[PDB]
Amino acid sequence: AFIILDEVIKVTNRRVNAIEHVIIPRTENTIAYINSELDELDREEFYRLKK
Amino acid sequence: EYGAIYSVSGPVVIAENMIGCAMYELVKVGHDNLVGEVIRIDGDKATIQVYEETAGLTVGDPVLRTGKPLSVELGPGLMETIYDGIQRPLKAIKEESQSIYIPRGIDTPALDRTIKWQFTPGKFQVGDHISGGDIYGSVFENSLISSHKILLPPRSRGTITWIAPAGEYTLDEKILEVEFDGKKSDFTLYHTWPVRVPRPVTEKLSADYPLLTGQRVLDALFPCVQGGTTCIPGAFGCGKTVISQSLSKYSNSDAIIYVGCGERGNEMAEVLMEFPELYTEMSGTKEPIMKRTTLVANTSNMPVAAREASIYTGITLAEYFRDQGKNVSMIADSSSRWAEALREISGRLGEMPADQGFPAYLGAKLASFYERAGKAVALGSPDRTGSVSIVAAVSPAGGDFSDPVTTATLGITQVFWGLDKKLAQRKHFPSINTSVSYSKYTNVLNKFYDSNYPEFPVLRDRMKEILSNAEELEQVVQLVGKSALSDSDKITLDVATLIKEDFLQQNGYSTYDAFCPIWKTFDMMRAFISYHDEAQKAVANGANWSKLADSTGDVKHAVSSSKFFEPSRGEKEVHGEFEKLLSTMQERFAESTD
Amino acid sequence: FAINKKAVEQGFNVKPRLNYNTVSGVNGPLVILEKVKFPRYNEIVNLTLPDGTVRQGQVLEIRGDRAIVQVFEGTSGIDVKKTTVEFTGESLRIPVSEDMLGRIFDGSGRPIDNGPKVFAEDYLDINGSPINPYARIYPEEMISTGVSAIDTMNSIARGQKIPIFSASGLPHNEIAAQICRQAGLVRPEENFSIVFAAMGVNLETARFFKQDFEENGSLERTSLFLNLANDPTIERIITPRLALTTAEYLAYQTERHVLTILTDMSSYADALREVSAAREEVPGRRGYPGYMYTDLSTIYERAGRVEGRNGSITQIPILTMPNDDITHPIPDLTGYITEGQIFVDRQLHNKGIYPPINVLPSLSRLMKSAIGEGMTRKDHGDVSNQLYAKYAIGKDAAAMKAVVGEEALSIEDKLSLEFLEKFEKTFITQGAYEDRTVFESLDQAWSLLRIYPKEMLNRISPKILDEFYDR
Amino acid sequence: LTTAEYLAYQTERHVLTILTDMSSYADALREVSAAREEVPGRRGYPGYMYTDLSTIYERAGRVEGRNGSITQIPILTMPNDDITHPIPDLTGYITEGQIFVDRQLHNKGIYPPINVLPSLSRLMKSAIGEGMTRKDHGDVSNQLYAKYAIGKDAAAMKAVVGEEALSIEDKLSLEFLEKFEKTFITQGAYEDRTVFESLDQAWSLLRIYPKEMLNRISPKILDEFYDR
User: Fold this and answer.
1) CA-based nearest distance B479→chain D, Å
2) Do the Cβ atoms of B261 and B299 come closer than 8 Å?
3) Which of B456, C315, D120, D183 has its CB 3.0 to 4.6 Å from that of C161, i.e. a possible disulfide?
4) How far apart are CA C224 and CA C111, in angstroms?
């Protein structure tokens, strides 16, 4: 049981660290980029209507 | 009097020297007498919208004004016909011109003036007073609709002076003279009515009778009522074109219309050639189904000004039929394809868009169209009652919730059948999303249910909660893996899958399951709920479900095969089978706990 | 008195009206007059179509001898050589009286109950005159909604603004009717009235409201302002003005505690957006006009509780988030003006819970002012905390139970798993016509908190715990 | 198109039309519409571009009197590999199905780099069938589509959860997908296959699954053919 438990805890902790460090920030950056792009298009539409 | 053309740009013509033109009024443009409708007025100019294609219009061409807005012709001969957007007969044009093209600027009476009709006066005699909407005659059109009831058009009344006797007649022989301030009124077998003003009605009512579409999922979870709205996001996986035949061949509709507003062109050719061969057997044998149908075709390349004027024609016809105590049911083809044309017109005129380019009055334009639906008590001396139950359809342009059309419709519709990409990708038909969809009529239907099937609602609630729990556990079971689930939870998982695979799954291209009746659905639903409860009880009393599943066995397969009891067997010869199935299930569960 | 003097100098004098026949253009929903004598901004006119029918209108702009009228009921049928326009003289006014409770009016104040005209006591302008922010005083005491989820976990101090956020398919239009039918003052009717305004509703919903209030006695107090979907889309911005003018007449000139309910502010926003584009204004964010915050504030902030009067006005709007977007401009702008919100959850709706309220994101910013000794029982302010904590603990336990099984759960989580479903199936679940007072809901809340031993409940004060625990 | 119409409807012969860059056509439309000031549509394209394209795509099909037909296969280039662009978006509402060509398959040296998941043919269900093709043509395609989607989802899942979390269905689906994309789609630029050869080659793959796991397929069909 000691050996098996060591293995399982190791794998789960490794997966948690990976998800925390190299998954969430990537998606957050993607979301921010898309959010900026939407406003970028909105500005051009506004300018056309103004003209 | 005649004006003259002063400018031309696309489909927009600016006549001049026009004083006295209404804000909407048909005119005749050019030497071909193209039909158009004034849109804007400023001084003496009058921006006209042409329903044909403008090519060759020279300045100085005369413009003539008629003096009444876009009007549709109502009367005998509306059935079995096919019309374009603004109600011009199609096959009559074809066999009149002998060609395959549509000659520009062609006028043909929307109703044949050469067919003899049999007339039968009602119960009115000279010297009586008659008001708008009274019935004073009856014409025999088909065998499927044996009495087309004539109506005095609203906005007209007086005391009658001469009513024609029975015999044979056509649509140009006056059969009534009404005196109000002088006998300045003669009434033939038809009349006209502007398409934008809803027909007057005595009083609206509440819809308390379901529409039997035949799909188990809709009839069970999200029912619709006779005289309500709807919205059916569909992509031919949802079954837009499979339900269309069911709504006519099986649903109790005294009539039906159909409005293809922006169809592909080949699928329209399919519809036109495959309705004339469908057959029904309601009321003995009345084989053909076109005796009860009218169709308004509109290819995607027809003039954009004529795409907007389609649904108004359809709904006006539906209201006319309702005014005779029938139960019409529009089937609009595409609302999105209509809003696109509307936006195009708005942009052409010169306007300031709001939202994703739409004219910013889309909501208030859609509401007026939708809320012509609903049951009602007609207007006239003999008491009547009819309904019109629109069934729209929206096309999700990418995001099936962000497009302005869906947002506008969701505020005024009473039912919604959303589309989910996943059930389509797995080819799971019909593909409708139970997580995001609703039916506000689920409350008013219990008065019918309790008098018919007093258990149906609680069964529906139980099924909905089981299904919801399934997807609620889905995230955890996928992110971790099914290794710590209890024994009462795996039951929920394997019952949710069973329901999702053998209850909500249906294929209309077969014989056993093409139109599931209501009693069959109720029986299947009760059986599934009972099976789930029995499994839960078995685990509660103490038994590992992993082996209880093996011990039970065939009782799991029987329900999965319950969807094969063909309705043709009858109504009692299926009820007995279901009774014995339930009894066998109960006994098997009782004996397997030892 | 002074009334006899002001009435005479107001009435008992007649003023003829000019009648023009110089229409010189129609551009969509706008009609343009040409030679007007001293026009007046925001007037009311009466078009006479060449068919003898009559409509309404309102001047939007004025140039040197030129007025731009917009018709309510549409612009179809009006020509340029036979229509005539008549100028009433001044802006829109509502004939108000103290005896109009029990009447039903349509969008523009025209009664639709087959009764007579209101037989006014005065004419009031339908807007303006902000409340001086020196006569305002802070709210106190309680308004008893009669719903356990709203009168225990949250509260409504008389003088508050609490919007209710809903979604497209949720049954907010039934909760609103229930609140209107059951609402009242916490007892330990008699100067309490309700004002109801429905904007852009289905006809069936209008029938439902009418019959429900007629048959349940709520009409002896209320006063309805209906506005269907086919009604002119410009009347949809007059209705809240009429309702609020009536409310602040009753409350601040007859000493009544009034409750105002406004339905589908999203429809009002849509109407505003449509009207803005008629004047060719460049739309702001997401298509809504940039100055919508000002209008929303001018509508919400007509409620309060003032110094020299015993009356008050409580507000309860109802929104409809388009795509469950708490970032949508409408709810976002509503956030900065009102305090607190009640959230309606879709997930509970599928499970069959009614009313499908969820309490984790809900909040009332003035709850502490309407609880405690004097206006309710003295345990209110701690039961409403213990329940909130244990509910979140139960959600956590239920979410994690499937990961490590159930045998790896402490005693507290084990108990909370059975507290949670009882809470959600006996406390929140309330029947449509089941009425609970604030007291027999606190007692029920106790019946759930006795599941735990006296030791675990560590947020209730020992003094409270000593008395109420054992019964 | 005028020449094609003359040949097909007044000479009674079967024509096939190919149009290369509808994107370079919409571009010229946008340019000319911008020259004369107008209320712009989305991304600057004219509002009436839908009705302009409809007049192009809507010349096809048979007619009652003649024995000729016109078939259109307009090539098209999405700007940034997105179907949400106005040109492909609108063309989706006028034509009948698409034939998607995907970049990711191309990068992996697969030809033709067609992606079947987002493609479509709205007239397939009438052109196929018994008496005109093999009786099983209407179910093999559905089964392959379903398994392609399932395997794609499994491959997506492997990234963040690991192979060990996969189930038997997911164990098989990855193999099916990896052999499918490399055997069934991959084809030489001169190799010719009839419908029957392709159907047999497709049946080959489906033998990987046991009979019980094929559930989008008729019981009778599964018996007459699965045993070969």
Assistant:
1) 7
2) no
3) C315
4) 10
Check C76 against B24: CB less than 8 A apart: yes
Tokens of C45: 């006119």
CA-based nearest residue to B79, from B149, B179, B177, B148: B148
Among chain D residues, the shortest Cα distance to A11 is held by D162
Same domain, B420 and B507: no
Q: How far apart are CA B35 and CA B16, in angstroms?
A: 17
The one-letter amino acid at C99: D
Question: How many Å lie between the alpha carbon of A21 and the closest alpha carbon of chain C?
Answer: 22
Same domain, B452 and B479: yes
| Residue whose entry in the numeric block shows the structure tokens 């025999």 | B140
Interface test with B, best of C204, C347, C353, C406 (most B CBs within 10 A): C204
Resolution of this entry, Å: 4.2
Give the number of A-D residue pairs with CB atoms closer than 8 Å. Answer: 5
The answer on B214 and B162 residing in a single domain is no
For residue D183 the two structure tokens come to 């055997």
Please indicate, yes or no, whether residues B53 and B169 belong to a single structural domain of this protein. Answer: no
CB contact under 8 A, A23 and D160: yes
Token duo for residue B70? 């876009």
CB B422 within 8 A of CB B436: no
d(CA C461, CA C348): 32
Tell me which of B146, B165, B187 is where a domain ends: B187
Q: Residue B475 corresponds to which amino acid? A: Q
Annotated binding site of C: 365
Distance CA B93, CA C303 (A): 66
Same domain, B261 and B408: yes
DSSP per residue over D42-63, as a string?
Answer: GGG--TTHHHHHHHHHT--S--
> Which residues is C70 bridged to in the sheet?
C30, C58
User: What phi and psi, each to the nearest 5 degrees, are found at residue D59?
Assistant: -115, 100
Handedness of CA C224, C230, C235, C238 (dihedral sign): positive
Domain boundary (B133, B168, B187) is at B187
Q: Do B464 and C352 touch (CB under 8 A)?
A: yes
Q: Does A8 touch chain D (CB under 8 A)?
A: no
Q: How many domains does chain B have?
A: 4
In one letter, which amino acid is B298? N
**Residues in CB range of B74: below 8 A, 6 or more apart:** B190, B191, B192, B193, B316, B317, B320
From A41's Cα to the closest Cα of chain D, the distance in A is 9
Cis ω before C355 (30° cut-off from 0): yes
* Kind plus residue range of the DSSP H or E element containing C25: strand C23-27
User: Are residues B75 and B215 part of one domain?
Assistant: yes
Technique used: cryo-EM
Whether residue B377 sits in one domain with residue B339? yes
Token output for C376: 């309710």
**C-alpha span between C317 and C269 (Å, rounded):** 13
Pair B202, B321 in one domain: yes
Sole residue written with tokens 């039934």: C174
φ and ψ at residue C161, rounded to 5 degrees: -130, 105
Cis amide linkage into residue D112, ω under 30° from 0: yes
Chain B, nearest residue to D86 by Cα: B397
For residue B165, give its domain range.
115-187
Interface test with B, best of D62, D64, D93 (most B CBs within 10 A): D93
